[PDB]
Design a protein around this nucleic acid. Structure first.
Ligand code: MG
Ligand code: MG
Ligand code: MG
Ligand code: ZN
Lengths: 68, 241, 57, 120, 50
RNA sequence: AGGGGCUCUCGCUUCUGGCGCCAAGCGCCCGGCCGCGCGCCGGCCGGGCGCGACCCGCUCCGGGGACAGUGCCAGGUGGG
């Protein structure tokens, strides 16, 4: 049931918990460099429903795009 | 008594413009690498900002002596490793070969790890106790778990150490661990620890749920405002009376 | 001479038998000697002037 | 106490760098030295200027490979002609091969060396 | 060059390692070679000091 | 007239075109040598620690600062 709880929590993006987490993680991704390798998926339920499996040979890269 | 007259105390003074500075400790003023600056400023940020109660509850961890007592209890019921497991399988195979037969022989109680597993256990009221690590670094895999264990009425505790959980379950890290039913000689150890944990966590959940966190200023800022408050009080106490 | 011929010369041809010899002139050597001496003497007399004017409250 | 940072600069701490112990050589055998002595010396030169150099300066003159240097030419001559070499002056011709004059040690004689070679 | 306002090459003593450090102060009028200049909050109000 | 509470004081460089780093000293230990040979015990060769160089602390220090700035839209201006 755990992934269902994470899924509902990540749909509640304007809650105070999620807006705190999003702001602090946005701050630290801003402090990192533009193309970066993550050591693990930040959103594991989203990653697995998009195809990721916790095996050797699946890697995760964080990319920053200048928006507009 | 026979000391040499050629030896002499020759001190050096380290005033400004005088003899050059000694290699004193510089560890506060180091140009640190950016990952060190990032983790230090992340810790500072958490303390500075207003942290919601669903994360403050994970800040409120357990007392050390009860934590060690719980670990002793968990070490009594830790899962088995691969080598002792295969020894158990070969022993089962040889006793099945000769000669008493199927013999399930009362499959022992064991700890149950993993957030999906314990979410099912809490949801169907199977667990006697839930223990959750305080430093899950993506802290949103567990922020629903205290409310869930509260509503189901299962006692849960926030332990201080994810690696400590992982080491008792023979891996690197582990998020949560559930206690199911236990043998008779440790039922009394439970029958003290469970109401200790329940009085620490479940009975004061509303206070926990409304108690906010963070929002403390830096040492320089609190020193400056304390200077201003005492610099007003030191003459207001003389104006009064 | 040129610097690389200075490499293959000898130590006597490149310096003078004096302290700071072959880098400074004799006149400024003498002036720095007596300047060091006189400034240390002035520091001694200021220290003993304070040490005798420890005779107050 | 008692570990102290006496410098305001963090430097990358030096670590262990292992040598290679490969599981297999990337190629099978060492490559053949295709510049051996017979490849170094191609043929002698037998022009009139060559004969003048032979009878006057106790020196032979060969057309040699473009890749060969004076050390390789001297070693190749001393090996496959079994003589001693005083010095070697080389040029590259406007056709593109290396002409090498090799002056022998004085106890040897360019006349009888050229007689043993057969350019005489 | 391209400036004319003279520069003062001034040598200070480094306080943390055995070395002398040179600066390139803008020369205030009246200063001369071989004089001392002083820099800090407790320097005296003379011409050329900082 | 001993002082503490109360401030400036826990500040050591200004007549001179010099020098200045890679610690002196003190205190406590550890080892070998002969050896008083009775033990903090005699001395000879070494080695270490601490104070000298105060202790804690969560942003390197200072200046700004929820503005600036940037993204998107809107109005004006725009023979560049
Ligand atoms: Mg000379
Ligand atoms: Mg040439
Ligand atoms: Mg037009
Ligand atoms: Zn001079």
């Amino acid at each position: 049931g755990a992934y269902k709880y994470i899924q509902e929590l990540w749909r509640k993006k304007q809650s105070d918990v999620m807006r705190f987490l999003l702001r602090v993680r946005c701050w630290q991704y801003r402090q990192l460099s533009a193309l970066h390798r993550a050591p693990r998926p930040t959103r594991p339920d989203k990653a697995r429903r998009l195809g990721y499996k916790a095996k050797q040979g699946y890697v995760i890269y964080r990319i920053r795009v200048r928006r507009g | 008594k026979v000391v040499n007259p050629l030896f002499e105390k020759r001190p050096k003074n380290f005033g400004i413009g005088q003899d050059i500075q000694p290699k004193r400790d510089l560890t506060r003023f180091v140009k640190w690498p950016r990952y060190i600056r990032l983790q230090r400023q992340r810790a500072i940020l958490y303390k500075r900002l207003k942290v919601p109660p669903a994360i403050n509850q994970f800040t409120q961890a357990l007392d050390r002596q009860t934590a060690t007592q719980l670990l002793k209890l968990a070490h009594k019921y830790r899962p088995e490793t691969k080598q002792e497991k295969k020894q158990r399988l070969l022993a089962r195979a040889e006793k099945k070969a000769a000669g008493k037969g199927d013999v399930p022989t009362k499959r022992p109680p064991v700890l149950r790890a993993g957030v999906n597993t314990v979410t099912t256990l809490v949801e169907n009221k199977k667990a006697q106790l839930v223990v959750i690590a305080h430093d899950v670094d993506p802290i949103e895999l567990v922020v629903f778990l205290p409310a869930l264990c509260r509503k189901m009425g299962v006692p849960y505790c926030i332990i201080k150490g994810k690696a400590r959980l992982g080491r008792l379950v023979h891996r690197k890290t582990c998020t949560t661990v559930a206690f199911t039913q236990v043998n008779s000689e440790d039922k009394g150890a439970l029958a003290k620890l469970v109401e200790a944990i329940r009085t620490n966590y479940n009975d004061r959940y509303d206070e926990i749920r409304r108690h906010w966190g963070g929002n403390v200023l830096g040492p320089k800022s609190v020193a400056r405002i304390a200077k201003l408050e005492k610099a007003k009080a030191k003459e207001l106490a003389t104006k009064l009376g | 001479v040129r610097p690389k011929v200075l490499m293959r010369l000898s130590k006597t041809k490149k310096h003078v038998s004096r302290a700071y010899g072959g880098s400074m002139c004799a006149k400024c050597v003498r002036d720095r000697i007596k300047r060091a001496f006189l400034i240390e003497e002035q520091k001694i007399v200021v220290k003993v002037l304070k040490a005798q004017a420890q005779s107050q409250k | 106490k008692k570990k102290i940072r006496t410098s305001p600069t963090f430097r990358r701490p030096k670590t262990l760098r292992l040598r290679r112990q490969p599981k297999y050589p990337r190629k099978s055998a060492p490559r053949r030295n295709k510049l051996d002595h017979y490849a170094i010396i191609k043929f002698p030169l037998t022009t009139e200027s060559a004969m003048k150099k032979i009878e006057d300066n106790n020196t032979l003159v060969f057309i040699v490979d473009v890749k060969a240097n004076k050390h390789q030419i001297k070693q190749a001559v001393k090996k496959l002609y079994d003589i001693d070499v005083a010095k070697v002056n080389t040029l590259i011709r406007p056709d593109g091969e290396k002409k090498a004059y090799v002056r022998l040690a004085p106890d040897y004689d360019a006349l009888d060396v050229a007689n043993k070679i057969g350019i005489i | 060059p391209g400036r004319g306002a003279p520069l003062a090459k001034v040598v200070f003593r480094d306080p943390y390692r055995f070395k002398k450090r040179t600066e390139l102060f803008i020369a205030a009028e009246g200063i001369h070679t071989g004089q001392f200049v002083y820099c800090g909050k407790k320097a005296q109000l003379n011409i050329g000091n900082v």
